Structure formats: structure tokens, C-alpha cells
Amino acid sequence: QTLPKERRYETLSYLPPLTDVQIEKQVQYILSQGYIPAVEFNEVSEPTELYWTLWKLPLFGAKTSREVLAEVQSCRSQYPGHYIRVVGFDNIKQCQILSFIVHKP
């Protein structure tokens, strides 16, 4: 048996396609470390192309609640043909704590 030529995308791509319960349980790691999470959309996932466009904000309303999870489904209804992400942000270390695709075209 072999390995197929399959294009893979980001830091959780070598998995089954992430359902909604998992992403609710995924962002609950992001915002529980004091981090501000976000949603980033893009047309293609290119190695050259290293910015993806931020969706409305790095949204945040409280210490821990459903913030991102409702906003992704609003972006699935807005952009059903863009690579949607969920990214974290740290401000002390000043890099992203996650970057993974929740939705593909």
C-alpha cells in the first residue's frame, strides 16, 4: 500500500475533517490560555501566500465563551468558497498560538 498525492493545508490537516464539537473544544484551548482567537479567510492556501484575510476582528467578549464558533458558521454562510481558518493570538510571546483550517471549498 502507498501514500496518495493529496494536497494538505495547515497544522491540523492530517486528521479527519474537523466537526463542530471538536472546534468548540479546540477554541476552548485558545481562549482559556488568555489568548484572543480570530477567523481568517482566503481564496487559496499557497505556500508563497502567507497572509490570510481577517474576518471582522479577533473577536472576544469574555474570559471564556462561544465567540469564534458562531462567527465561523456566519462565515460559512457568507463565504462558502473560501479557505476559512481559526487562528489564535498571543500578545506576550507575540505570535499565533494556532492556525488551522475549519472549512475548505
Binding site: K5, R7, R8, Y9, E10, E46, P47, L50
Partner: peptide, 8 residues
């Protein structure tokens, strides 16, 4: 890198 879009 061109096959799978990560910066290898």
C-alpha cells in the same frame, strides 16, 4: 512545497 502547500 508546490504539491502540498506548506513551506517545506
Amino acid at each position: 512545497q508546490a504539491e502540498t502547500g506548506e513551506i517545506k
